[PDB]
Short mmCIF file of C-alpha atoms in Angstrom, two decimals:
data_model
loop_
_atom_site.label_atom_id
_atom_site.label_comp_id
_atom_site.label_asym_id
_atom_site.label_seq_id
_atom_site.Cartn_x
_atom_site.Cartn_y
_atom_site.Cartn_z
CA UNK A 1 -0.14 -0.23 0.17
CA UNK A 2 0.99 3.66 -0.60
CA UNK A 3 -0.91 5.61 2.03
CA UNK A 4 -1.60 9.46 1.75
CA UNK A 5 -3.06 12.13 3.65
CA UNK A 6 -3.85 16.23 2.69
CA UNK A 7 -3.26 18.91 5.80
CA UNK A 8 -2.56 22.22 5.97
CA UNK A 9 0.09 24.05 5.41
CA UNK A 10 2.27 25.41 7.95
CA UNK A 11 4.60 28.31 7.97
CA UNK A 12 7.48 25.42 8.13
CA UNK A 13 6.29 24.02 5.04
CA UNK A 14 7.89 27.14 3.17
CA UNK A 15 10.89 25.20 1.58
CA UNK A 16 8.55 22.44 0.73
CA UNK A 17 5.55 24.52 -1.00
CA UNK A 18 8.69 26.91 -2.89
CA UNK A 19 10.65 23.47 -3.95
CA UNK A 20 6.83 22.29 -5.81
CA UNK A 21 6.41 26.04 -6.95
CA UNK A 22 9.41 25.15 -9.01
CA UNK A 23 8.72 21.88 -9.82
CA UNK A 24 5.16 22.79 -11.43
CA UNK A 25 7.02 26.31 -13.46
CA UNK A 26 9.90 23.91 -14.41
CA UNK A 27 7.15 21.59 -15.75
CA UNK A 28 5.43 23.65 -17.16
CA UNK A 29 8.39 25.47 -18.83
CA UNK A 30 7.55 28.75 -17.31
CA UNK A 31 10.52 28.92 -14.68
CA UNK A 32 11.34 32.55 -16.73
CA UNK A 33 8.37 33.04 -14.85
CA UNK A 34 9.26 32.29 -11.48
CA UNK A 35 10.86 34.72 -8.94
CA UNK A 36 8.89 33.03 -5.68
CA UNK A 37 11.13 33.23 -2.24
CA UNK A 38 11.34 31.01 0.60
CA UNK A 39 11.50 34.63 2.49
CA UNK A 40 8.31 35.98 0.22
CA UNK A 41 6.43 32.69 0.65
CA UNK A 42 6.18 33.45 4.52
CA UNK A 43 5.94 37.23 4.40
CA UNK A 44 2.52 36.50 2.60
CA UNK A 45 1.00 32.78 2.57
CA UNK A 46 0.20 33.47 6.40
CA UNK A 47 -1.19 36.91 7.36
CA UNK A 48 -4.53 35.39 8.70
CA UNK A 49 -5.86 31.74 10.06
CA UNK A 50 -6.84 29.16 7.24
CA UNK A 51 -9.56 29.47 5.04
CA UNK A 52 -9.69 33.44 6.37
CA UNK A 53 -7.37 34.18 3.18
CA UNK A 54 -4.26 32.34 1.23
CA UNK A 55 -4.82 28.49 2.05
CA UNK A 56 -1.97 25.03 1.07
CA UNK A 57 -3.59 21.86 1.56
CA UNK A 58 -0.01 19.89 1.55
CA UNK A 59 -1.07 16.38 0.18
CA UNK A 60 1.70 13.35 1.68
CA UNK A 61 2.66 9.93 1.22
CA UNK A 62 4.17 7.18 3.30
CA UNK A 63 4.49 3.68 2.77
CA UNK A 64 2.95 3.15 6.13
CA UNK A 65 -0.29 4.16 8.71
CA UNK A 66 -0.42 8.01 8.98
CA UNK A 67 -1.72 8.90 11.95
CA UNK A 68 -5.52 9.27 12.50
CA UNK A 69 -6.12 12.76 13.62
CA UNK A 70 -3.36 15.99 13.69
CA UNK A 71 -3.84 17.89 16.82
CA UNK A 72 -1.92 21.15 16.44
CA UNK A 73 -3.90 21.83 12.91
CA UNK A 74 -3.97 25.90 12.41
CA UNK A 75 -7.96 25.77 12.16
CA UNK A 76 -10.68 24.21 14.01
CA UNK A 77 -12.63 23.49 11.45
CA UNK A 78 -9.55 21.04 9.48
CA UNK A 79 -9.77 17.72 9.81
CA UNK A 80 -7.48 15.88 7.44
CA UNK A 81 -8.21 13.92 4.27
CA UNK A 82 -7.14 10.63 3.90
CA UNK A 83 -6.84 7.18 1.28
CA UNK A 84 -5.00 4.45 1.00
CA UNK A 85 -3.38 3.05 -2.47
CA UNK A 86 -2.93 -0.03 -3.91
CA UNK A 87 8.35 3.98 -6.52
CA UNK A 88 11.95 5.52 -6.18
CA UNK A 89 11.77 8.93 -5.45
CA UNK A 90 15.58 10.82 -5.54
CA UNK A 91 14.07 13.95 -4.10
CA UNK A 92 12.40 12.95 -1.16
CA UNK A 93 15.11 14.49 0.48
CA UNK A 94 14.40 17.37 0.35
CA UNK A 95 10.50 16.98 0.83
CA UNK A 96 10.60 15.23 4.03
CA UNK A 97 8.98 17.26 7.13
CA UNK A 98 10.26 15.57 9.71
CA UNK A 99 13.58 13.78 8.64
CA UNK A 100 13.35 11.21 9.97
CA UNK A 101 9.89 9.97 9.94
CA UNK A 102 8.62 8.18 7.00
CA UNK A 103 6.13 10.76 5.13
CA UNK A 104 7.23 12.80 1.96
CA UNK A 105 5.20 16.45 0.84
CA UNK A 106 4.27 14.97 -3.01
CA UNK A 107 2.31 17.79 -3.76
CA UNK A 108 -0.35 20.75 -3.17
CA UNK A 109 -3.32 22.63 -3.18
CA UNK A 110 -3.02 26.60 -2.95
CA UNK A 111 -6.90 28.98 -2.66
CA UNK A 112 -8.23 31.31 -1.26
CA UNK A 113 -11.60 32.70 -0.60
CA UNK A 114 -14.12 34.17 -3.07
CA UNK A 115 -16.90 36.00 -2.13
CA UNK A 116 -21.20 35.74 -3.56
CA UNK A 117 -22.51 39.80 -3.39
CA UNK A 118 -25.89 38.05 -4.44
CA UNK A 119 -25.68 35.36 -2.03
CA UNK A 120 -23.61 36.69 1.38
CA UNK A 121 -21.97 33.75 1.49
CA UNK A 122 -18.22 32.87 0.86
CA UNK A 123 -16.80 30.58 -1.77
CA UNK A 124 -13.19 28.96 -2.55
CA UNK A 125 -11.94 29.66 -5.57
CA UNK A 126 -8.31 27.13 -6.26
CA UNK A 127 -5.58 28.89 -7.64
CA UNK A 128 -2.59 26.54 -8.33
CA UNK A 129 -2.75 21.86 -8.15
CA UNK A 130 0.54 20.97 -8.42
CA UNK A 131 1.91 16.92 -7.94
CA UNK A 132 5.63 16.11 -8.55
CA UNK A 133 6.94 13.03 -10.07
CA UNK A 134 7.50 10.88 -9.08
CA UNK A 135 3.41 10.36 -8.01
CA UNK A 136 2.48 11.67 -10.90
CA UNK A 137 -0.94 9.45 -12.89
CA UNK A 138 -2.15 8.20 -9.79
CA UNK A 139 -5.11 11.06 -9.37
CA UNK A 140 -3.43 12.83 -6.72
CA UNK A 141 -4.07 16.56 -8.38
CA UNK A 142 -8.25 15.25 -8.18
CA UNK A 143 -7.77 13.99 -4.64
CA UNK A 144 -6.47 17.69 -4.13
CA UNK A 145 -9.64 19.42 -5.62
CA UNK A 146 -12.12 17.13 -4.53
CA UNK A 147 -10.43 18.03 -0.57
CA UNK A 148 -11.13 21.59 -1.55
CA UNK A 149 -14.61 20.43 -2.42
CA UNK A 150 -15.67 18.29 0.76
CA UNK A 151 -13.77 21.29 2.67
CA UNK A 152 -16.36 24.00 1.08
CA UNK A 153 -19.32 22.01 2.35
CA UNK A 154 -18.31 21.63 5.94
CA UNK A 155 -17.66 25.15 6.39
CA UNK A 156 -20.98 25.95 4.06
CA UNK A 157 -19.46 27.85 1.76
CA UNK A 158 -21.36 28.62 -1.38
CA UNK A 159 -19.24 27.64 -4.15
CA UNK A 160 -16.03 26.77 -5.77
CA UNK A 161 -14.13 27.87 -8.33
CA UNK A 162 -11.16 27.60 -10.82
CA UNK A 163 -9.99 28.47 -14.12
CA UNK A 164 -8.87 25.41 -17.30
CA UNK A 165 -7.70 26.06 -20.80
CA UNK A 166 -10.36 25.95 -23.03
CA UNK A 167 -8.81 23.43 -25.70
CA UNK A 168 -8.64 21.81 -22.27
CA UNK A 169 -11.32 18.63 -23.40
CA UNK A 170 -10.46 16.19 -20.91
CA UNK A 171 -10.13 18.24 -18.02
CA UNK A 172 -13.64 19.92 -18.92
CA UNK A 173 -14.74 16.50 -19.33
CA UNK A 174 -13.90 15.66 -16.27
CA UNK A 175 -15.36 18.94 -14.32
CA UNK A 176 -18.39 18.54 -16.27
CA UNK A 177 -18.90 14.47 -14.98
CA UNK A 178 -18.36 15.98 -11.04
CA UNK A 179 -21.22 18.49 -12.06
CA UNK A 180 -19.21 21.82 -12.35
CA UNK A 181 -20.10 24.03 -15.14
CA UNK A 182 -18.07 26.10 -17.90
CA UNK A 183 -18.71 29.65 -18.15
CA UNK A 184 -18.50 29.91 -22.33
CA UNK A 185 -19.40 33.98 -20.76
CA UNK A 186 -16.25 35.62 -19.15
CA UNK A 187 -12.74 35.80 -20.03
CA UNK A 188 -10.33 36.65 -17.41
CA UNK A 189 -8.36 40.33 -17.47
CA UNK A 190 -5.05 41.40 -15.91
CA UNK A 191 -3.45 44.50 -14.88
CA UNK A 192 0.25 43.95 -13.75
CA UNK A 193 3.56 45.26 -14.54
CA UNK A 194 4.37 48.37 -15.48
CA UNK A 195 0.23 48.77 -16.68
CA UNK A 196 -0.47 48.51 -13.20
CA UNK A 197 2.54 50.86 -12.32
CA UNK A 198 1.22 54.03 -14.34
CA UNK A 199 -1.22 53.98 -11.86
CA UNK A 200 0.27 55.24 -9.48
CA UNK A 201 0.42 58.50 -11.12
CA UNK A 202 -3.54 58.64 -11.27
CA UNK A 203 -4.47 62.15 -9.19
CA UNK A 204 -7.08 60.77 -6.85
CA UNK B 1 -19.50 71.14 -7.88
CA UNK B 2 -19.89 67.25 -6.72
CA UNK B 3 -17.15 65.77 -4.79
CA UNK B 4 -16.85 62.68 -4.63
CA UNK B 5 -14.35 60.26 -1.66
CA UNK B 6 -13.54 56.38 -1.79
CA UNK B 7 -13.25 54.46 1.41
CA UNK B 8 -13.33 51.25 3.34
CA UNK B 9 -16.09 50.40 4.75
CA UNK B 10 -16.30 49.02 8.18
CA UNK B 11 -19.43 46.67 9.79
CA UNK B 12 -21.99 49.61 10.52
CA UNK B 13 -21.83 50.18 6.38
CA UNK B 14 -23.58 46.85 6.32
CA UNK B 15 -27.42 48.35 5.25
CA UNK B 16 -25.68 50.03 2.65
CA UNK B 17 -23.47 47.39 1.28
CA UNK B 18 -26.99 44.83 1.30
CA UNK B 19 -28.98 47.89 -0.51
CA UNK B 20 -26.10 48.67 -2.87
CA UNK B 21 -26.27 44.99 -4.02
CA UNK B 22 -29.78 44.44 -3.98
CA UNK B 23 -29.78 47.53 -6.49
CA UNK B 24 -27.12 45.76 -8.24
CA UNK B 25 -29.77 42.21 -8.47
CA UNK B 26 -32.24 44.80 -9.15
CA UNK B 27 -30.42 46.92 -11.97
CA UNK B 28 -29.17 43.37 -13.70
CA UNK B 29 -32.88 41.62 -13.50
CA UNK B 30 -30.98 38.43 -11.10
CA UNK B 31 -33.18 39.56 -7.98
CA UNK B 32 -34.03 35.88 -7.74
CA UNK B 33 -30.10 35.06 -7.34
CA UNK B 34 -30.12 37.63 -3.91
CA UNK B 35 -30.54 35.59 -0.54
CA UNK B 36 -28.23 37.80 0.78
CA UNK B 37 -28.69 39.18 4.65
CA UNK B 38 -27.25 41.67 6.71
CA UNK B 39 -26.07 39.18 9.65
CA UNK B 40 -24.78 36.70 6.49
CA UNK B 41 -22.86 40.39 4.89
CA UNK B 42 -21.80 41.36 9.06
CA UNK B 43 -20.99 37.55 9.64
CA UNK B 44 -18.48 37.53 6.66
CA UNK B 45 -17.26 39.76 5.08
CA UNK B 46 -15.35 41.21 8.06
CA UNK B 47 -13.52 38.44 9.85
CA UNK B 48 -9.66 39.51 8.61
CA UNK B 49 -8.98 42.60 8.31
CA UNK B 50 -8.36 45.05 5.62
CA UNK B 51 -6.34 43.57 1.99
CA UNK B 52 -5.83 40.13 3.72
CA UNK B 53 -9.24 38.43 2.78
CA UNK B 54 -12.23 40.38 1.50
CA UNK B 55 -12.62 44.18 1.12
CA UNK B 56 -15.52 47.01 0.56
CA UNK B 57 -14.40 50.13 -0.97
CA UNK B 58 -17.34 52.65 -1.04
CA UNK B 59 -18.06 56.14 -2.75
CA UNK B 60 -19.60 58.24 -1.55
CA UNK B 61 -20.45 61.44 -2.50
CA UNK B 62 -21.41 65.26 -1.16
CA UNK B 63 -22.38 68.92 -2.65
CA UNK B 64 -20.01 69.95 0.33
CA UNK B 65 -16.00 68.68 0.48
CA UNK B 66 -15.13 65.89 2.76
CA UNK B 67 -12.39 65.50 5.57
CA UNK B 68 -9.23 65.38 4.30
CA UNK B 69 -8.44 62.63 6.55
CA UNK B 70 -9.65 59.57 7.95
CA UNK B 71 -8.50 59.23 11.38
CA UNK B 72 -10.18 55.96 12.11
CA UNK B 73 -9.61 53.88 8.41
CA UNK B 74 -9.16 49.95 9.97
CA UNK B 75 -5.82 49.35 7.81
CA UNK B 76 -3.08 51.76 8.11
CA UNK B 77 -1.91 51.31 4.78
CA UNK B 78 -5.36 52.76 3.56
CA UNK B 79 -5.76 56.77 3.30
CA UNK B 80 -9.02 57.95 0.79
CA UNK B 81 -9.55 58.94 -2.19
CA UNK B 82 -11.27 62.08 -3.82
CA UNK B 83 -12.18 64.08 -6.76
CA UNK B 84 -14.38 66.91 -7.70
CA UNK B 85 -17.27 66.86 -10.21
CA UNK B 86 -18.42 69.16 -12.61
CA UNK B 87 -29.44 65.83 -9.11
CA UNK B 88 -32.52 64.41 -7.08
CA UNK B 89 -31.44 61.13 -4.90
CA UNK B 90 -34.81 60.11 -3.70
CA UNK B 91 -33.09 56.97 -1.80
CA UNK B 92 -30.74 59.47 -0.11
CA UNK B 93 -32.37 58.65 3.59
CA UNK B 94 -31.36 54.70 2.91
CA UNK B 95 -27.80 55.67 2.04
CA UNK B 96 -26.79 58.12 5.12
CA UNK B 97 -23.95 56.34 7.37
CA UNK B 98 -24.56 60.02 9.45
CA UNK B 99 -28.35 61.04 8.91
CA UNK B 100 -27.31 64.81 9.69
CA UNK B 101 -24.11 64.66 7.36
CA UNK B 102 -24.92 65.96 4.05
CA UNK B 103 -22.63 62.82 2.46
CA UNK B 104 -24.51 59.03 0.91
CA UNK B 105 -23.05 55.89 0.09
CA UNK B 106 -23.24 55.63 -3.97
CA UNK B 107 -21.78 52.52 -4.76
CA UNK B 108 -18.88 50.14 -4.40
CA UNK B 109 -16.66 47.38 -5.10
CA UNK B 110 -15.79 43.86 -3.85
CA UNK B 111 -12.98 42.53 -3.72
CA UNK B 112 -10.39 40.07 -2.17
CA UNK B 113 -6.63 39.12 -2.84
CA UNK B 114 -5.72 36.57 -4.89
CA UNK B 115 -1.87 34.98 -5.25
CA UNK B 116 0.71 34.32 -8.42
CA UNK B 117 2.15 31.40 -6.75
CA UNK B 118 5.55 32.08 -9.14
CA UNK B 119 6.10 35.73 -8.21
CA UNK B 120 5.23 34.55 -3.74
CA UNK B 121 2.90 37.63 -3.99
CA UNK B 122 -0.96 39.00 -3.70
CA UNK B 123 -2.72 40.47 -5.84
CA UNK B 124 -6.45 41.47 -6.14
CA UNK B 125 -9.45 40.23 -6.98
CA UNK B 126 -12.40 42.28 -8.24
CA UNK B 127 -15.88 40.30 -8.19
CA UNK B 128 -18.58 43.50 -8.03
CA UNK B 129 -18.79 47.19 -8.91
CA UNK B 130 -22.17 48.99 -8.73
CA UNK B 131 -22.98 52.24 -8.74
CA UNK B 132 -26.07 53.57 -7.82
CA UNK B 133 -28.69 55.11 -9.66
CA UNK B 134 -28.83 58.42 -9.85
CA UNK B 135 -25.00 58.34 -10.25
CA UNK B 136 -23.99 56.34 -12.74
CA UNK B 137 -23.25 57.83 -16.48
CA UNK B 138 -20.73 59.46 -14.70
CA UNK B 139 -17.53 57.58 -15.03
CA UNK B 140 -17.76 56.25 -10.89
CA UNK B 141 -17.60 53.09 -11.79
CA UNK B 142 -14.09 53.48 -13.58
CA UNK B 143 -13.26 55.46 -10.43
CA UNK B 144 -14.05 52.69 -8.68
CA UNK B 145 -11.57 50.05 -9.57
CA UNK B 146 -8.73 52.97 -10.64
CA UNK B 147 -8.94 53.18 -6.55
CA UNK B 148 -8.38 49.48 -6.15
CA UNK B 149 -5.66 49.24 -8.99
CA UNK B 150 -3.39 52.48 -6.94
CA UNK B 151 -4.15 50.42 -3.84
CA UNK B 152 -2.65 47.15 -5.16
CA UNK B 153 0.37 49.90 -6.40
CA UNK B 154 1.03 51.73 -2.91
CA UNK B 155 1.03 47.59 -1.73
CA UNK B 156 3.29 46.00 -3.78
CA UNK B 157 0.57 44.15 -4.67
CA UNK B 158 1.40 42.02 -8.48
CA UNK B 159 -2.22 42.00 -9.98
CA UNK B 160 -5.18 43.04 -10.70
CA UNK B 161 -7.54 40.64 -11.96
CA UNK B 162 -11.28 40.97 -12.57
CA UNK B 163 -13.81 39.20 -15.53
CA UNK B 164 -15.46 40.52 -18.59
CA UNK B 165 -18.21 39.48 -20.88
CA UNK B 166 -17.06 38.42 -24.08
CA UNK B 167 -19.34 40.37 -25.94
CA UNK B 168 -18.72 43.50 -23.63
CA UNK B 169 -16.70 45.21 -26.58
CA UNK B 170 -16.80 48.65 -25.12
CA UNK B 171 -15.27 47.28 -21.85
CA UNK B 172 -12.94 45.70 -23.40
CA UNK B 173 -11.65 47.91 -25.38
CA UNK B 174 -11.76 50.49 -21.96
CA UNK B 175 -9.81 48.22 -20.41
CA UNK B 176 -7.15 47.21 -22.64
CA UNK B 177 -6.82 50.97 -23.23
CA UNK B 178 -5.69 51.17 -19.88
CA UNK B 179 -2.82 48.07 -20.15
CA UNK B 180 -4.97 45.30 -19.18
CA UNK B 181 -4.74 42.35 -21.36
CA UNK B 182 -7.95 39.70 -21.89
CA UNK B 183 -6.68 36.26 -21.30
CA UNK B 184 -8.12 34.44 -24.47
CA UNK B 185 -7.27 30.97 -22.79
CA UNK B 186 -8.37 30.55 -20.01
CA UNK B 187 -12.26 30.14 -19.05
CA UNK B 188 -14.16 29.82 -15.59
CA UNK B 189 -15.68 26.74 -13.69
CA UNK B 190 -17.66 26.44 -11.16
CA UNK B 191 -19.15 23.62 -8.69
CA UNK B 192 -22.19 24.66 -6.85
CA UNK B 193 -25.32 23.53 -5.20
CA UNK B 194 -26.44 20.16 -4.86
CA UNK B 195 -23.21 19.34 -7.15
CA UNK B 196 -20.75 20.83 -4.58
CA UNK B 197 -22.84 19.17 -1.78
CA UNK B 198 -22.07 15.99 -2.60
CA UNK B 199 -18.97 15.78 -2.40
CA UNK B 200 -19.85 15.05 1.39
CA UNK B 201 -20.38 11.70 0.33
CA UNK B 202 -16.89 11.12 -0.65
CA UNK B 203 -14.62 8.69 0.70
CA UNK B 204 -11.85 10.58 2.51
#
């Protein structure tokens, strides 16, 4: 068996989050966009309590069972998620939160609360999901998405949202199978860089 | 002259936020979606500090000047925005935060922090902008969007994002004129309602 657990990230997890983000960039051939630092993550991701702002779930795996609970979780509204699944890991030493324990970080989901004005109810928006080698092709991306959905239900949140590439027909079918809807009318707009900085000059 | 100011909302503003959301629903012919309550807004919108989670800027107007500052703002990183502009308001009494003062709430912008993993930097996502009658056709929607952009710059945030209808050609041109980019490849996915609730049954 391979045991898996999904838990909340805390500040000590910053090195793993950093390295997972980097591996995601490498995977996507987008490393030219990577400027993330451990200091940056540490100073930005943990300014609020879980589920109140940026939240990260970490997927960990082990050849032996996980404990049934986490007593030190940074939210009273979270208990971990688990699955048992029926592999060489050269990066294991970079992904072990307790060097002596037989547990490694395998992936993450970064999400934050969004809001429906009409319902006066928060939801979650999923920004990134990434599962590192050698744990790909095992359904763990799905597991991470499912964890966010389940957390929303437990907390009475009204929606979980994310984006998908228009040509990602397999993912679109998968999302539809889950009962999600693809909203065909909307397009994302982004203001960044020098165009964003120019707003400093606007006299209000 | 008509003077305008954009400030941070606080919990006492809940009745105005409620009524603006309702007017937005009426405007859009989407009142069948409205289930917002003052209690709902009050218990959800103010669990964190401004800019750490859900944040609302309120647009107010007056025939006389506003004070130059707000000394009680709920964030040390915010000073209000102002403009002077060169009108019957039958709903004024429902929109006056100090009944005796000659100031009324005219509109709002509801936004929250999003995140760029690759930069380890927060941004803002704008969920809603609404300007009520009789203050439409005066550029105040733009002013509200500009306020969010300017706030992002002052705080060193990396991006401001929002969505636009694909057929809203005038707004798309306006966003492009501001230096924003429309990201043609992405589609929003939404999991809600019974489809979301079904995740309670998933055994992890």
